[PDB]
Symmetry: D2
Subunit: 121 residues, 4 copies
């Protein structure tokens, strides 16, 4: 879903996800979080199923953002794993994992889990 | 950890992860799974904290693989979120999310969760 | 939130959760799934924060269901971890982990992850 | 695995899990954490597959601990979802979700994810 995926999306927190789906299954763009140890735009890189089944199932995809830009460094990375669902109201349903660089003593508590829903709004 | 991260790594299942850490916090390479609906090498893309804290904490990183290559298409994507830990025995500790494109009726069961440990072996 | 938590709840899939919150932080009841390898009612057991903060934060709680009753056995267990949020429209926001008994060769793929929202409806 | 499961177990962090597996698929016992906002013993409640497959697959199980005892209250709950694996070196492989009661503004970051391995040691 190159055409489909490409665009500007917003999640339930007001975060902005600007993507471009390459023909070769590549995802590139920008991410800006409405919350956490972040400010402005961050670079994102990902991959998506460029030849989705024809039975009307969603398109599997994922992307990563290392929380470092010119303004700051949170020393953490988030990965979103979900599927794209086309139609009237297109959506991107995901689950994410946010990992903080920690000392070994604190690795037990290095990762958060949640889910975000994106819509063209 | 450009030097550190760059290399060939193996996880507890015998999977092979070949990465190159760019100066700009970019991760590119190849992934080959010892299990699941996969065969041969797949393209990977990710990001890592290119300016890790100096207190000896790990380096946050993540990558994605869309399970499609010339030989097959599993119509799924995996995202690994973890941290790189340097030293005598360098390691990459991660947690992953594997999402399958599904119909809406089956979205409840679209995603698996697990953890992989990588070592230069 | 004994009074609050006690009751019949439904999630986004039409599943029914009948709980009783004991004074001692115990949760007991029945669970019936609208999907998966299940039928009829299953026993549940859990625990909740019986002395929640007074700043208006949610109440942390969790419960488990081993997918075996008189009618069947799916040889799996689900654990829901979330928080109770009181008010006009009371809700229970959770994340769950569903683990299937597997052989060692297949342990990599033994666990699913998702989220359910419950309301008195 | 009543006999099998019943006992004292330790995870990779030095935490102690004392369980009793009831004939009816009930789990009761005590949990004491070597880390986090905890001290002494906490009550646990869970469920397990009391009639596991005969093909030598693991036994699915889960338990919860609300982090409140006489000494303190962390206003959080953990749920462990895994499987019991019998034999020479019996093990309990799990994944857990730790949820903190939070305000709505901070719900995005309410839950941690990790994995623990238990052995009779
Ligand atoms: O605190 C940092 O380490 C930066 C966190 C960035 C915000 C997180 S990523 C998951 C969730 N979805 C969003 O759009 N924002 C939060
Ligand atoms: O079945 C497919 O959809 C392909 C799955 C690929 C294998 C998974 S990704 C998580 C885990 N870590 C690995 O190295 N392999 C498995
Ligand atoms: O297939 C089995 O092993 C039984 C699965 C039971 C249904 C799951 S538990 C998570 C999700 N929430 C529900 O209410 N039902 C599904
Ligand atoms: O900080 C609190 O809220 C109490 C946390 C208790 C410790 C956690 S539960 C997951 C992990 N496994 C353990 O044995 N201890 C930690």
């Amino acid at each position: 879903a190159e055409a489909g995926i490409t665009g500007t999306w917003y999640n339930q927190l007001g975060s902005t996800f600007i993507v471009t789906a390459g023909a070769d299954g590549a995802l590139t763009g920008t991410y800006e979080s409405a919350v956490g140890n972040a400010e402005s735009r961050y670079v994102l890189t990902g991959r998506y199923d460029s030849a989705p089944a024809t039975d009307g199932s969603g398109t599997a995809l994922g992307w990563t953002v290392a929380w470092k830009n010119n303004y700051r460094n949170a020393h953490s990375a988030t990965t979103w794993s979900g599927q794209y669902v086309g139609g009237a109201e297109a959506r991107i349903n995901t689950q994410w994992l946010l990992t903080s660089g920690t000392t070994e003593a604190n690795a037990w508590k290095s990762t958060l889990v949640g889910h975000d829903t994106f819509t063209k709004v």
